[PDB]
Amino acid sequence: AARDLICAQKFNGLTVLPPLLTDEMIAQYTSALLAGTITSGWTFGAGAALQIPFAMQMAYRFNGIGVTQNVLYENQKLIANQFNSAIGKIQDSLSSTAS
Amino acid sequence: CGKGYHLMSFPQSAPHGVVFLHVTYVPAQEKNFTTAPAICHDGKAHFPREGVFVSNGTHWFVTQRNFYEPQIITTDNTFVSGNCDVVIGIVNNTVYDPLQPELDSFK
Amino acid sequence: LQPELDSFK
Numbered sequence: 411a412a413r414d415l416i417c418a419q420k421f422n423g424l425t426v427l428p429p430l431l432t433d434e435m436i437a438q439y440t441s442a443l444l445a446g447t448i449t450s451g452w453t454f455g456a457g458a459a460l461q462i463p464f465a466m467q468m469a470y471r472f473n474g475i476g477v478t479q480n481v482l483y484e485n486q487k488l489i490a491n492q493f494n495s496a497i498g499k500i501q502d503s504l505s506s507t508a509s
Numbered sequence: 510c511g512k513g514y515h516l517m518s519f520p521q522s523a524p525h526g527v528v529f530l531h532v533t534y535v536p537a538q539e540k541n542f543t544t545a546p547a548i549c550h551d552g553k554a555h556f557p558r559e560g561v562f563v564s565n566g567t568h569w570f571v572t573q574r575n576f577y578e579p580q581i582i583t584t585d586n587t588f589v590s591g592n593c594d595v596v597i598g599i600v601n602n603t604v605y606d607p608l609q610p611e612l613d614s615f616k
Numbered sequence: 617l618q619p620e621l622d623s624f625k
């Protein structure tokens with residue numbers, strides 16, 4: 411009894427095709443990229459995957475911004491707590507605001 | 510410009526276009542190693558200047574990141590920052606100093 | 617190097 415616009419678009423010859431990549435495969439690609447960039451870093455984009463501990467590739471990534479790597483190794487817990495708090499704040503910001 | 514670490518590129522003409530030849534750098538053959546972030550020696554934490562600490566099971570070396578060139582651990586390629594009771598995963602090893610044998614030989 | 621010379625002397 412409450413007719414929508416989708417049937418009227420369908421009955422006039424205006425069709426919508428489905429995409430080739432379903433969202434399950436997009437999620438699989440995203441999971442592959444995350445698992446590559448967590449356990450290996452930038453090495454999985456050049457050749458094969460090169461395993462490295464996370465607190466050591468983070469010290470590699472502080473060397474790219476002009477900070478020596480003792481800053482991580484003397485402040486690992488504080489940086490981990492700040493990252494976890496930022497992730498939780500991103501979660502709360504996505505939960506609250508829908509715009 | 511290509512896959513891998515970029516080295517050079519060459520241009521060529523084409524009908525309504527251009528064609529690039531990207532000469533890149535791709536690592537080939539890998540090997541597992543045991544690594545540590547720092548070395549506690551004489552109550553001091555030694556960190557590598559450039560490269561990374563690795564070990565072949567028994568002895569500890571320092572090498573560059575993109576090639577296996579193991580070198581002996583020396584005060585020249587390591588620097589000191591603080592005590593060795595704050596880094597998580599620090600191991601125990603000795604660090605060579607080239608000044609001391611020459612100073613003893615001058616005596 | 618000069619503290620090493622002082623310990624040398």
Ligand SMILES: *[C@@H]1O[C@H](CO)[C@@H](O[C@@H]2O[C@H](CO)[C@@H](O)[C@H](O)[C@H]2NC(C)=O)[C@H](O)[C@H]1NC(C)=O
Binds near residue numbers: 565568
């Ligand atoms: C780890 O590497 C070190 C040095 O690269 C090896 O130590 C040498 O091993 C050779 C074996 O032919 C000996 O002739 C040398 O005398 C050793 N060096 C010293 C200073 O003694 C060590 O054997 C390697 N260990 C493993 C398990 O591969």
Ligand SMILES: *[C@@H]1O[C@H](CO)[C@@H](O)[C@H](O)[C@H]1NC(C)=O
Binds near residue numbers: 539540541
């Ligand atoms: C390193 O160790 C892993 C452990 O499962 C093994 O599968 C792999 O073949 C080893 N060698 C290389 C080059 O990754």
Ligand SMILES: *[C@@H]1O[C@H](CO)[C@@H](O)[C@H](O)[C@H]1NC(C)=O
Binds near residue numbers: 549599600601
């Ligand atoms: C390194 O040496 C110190 C003192 O000699 C000791 O307390 C510490 O446990 C040693 N490290 C390891 C991994 O055994």
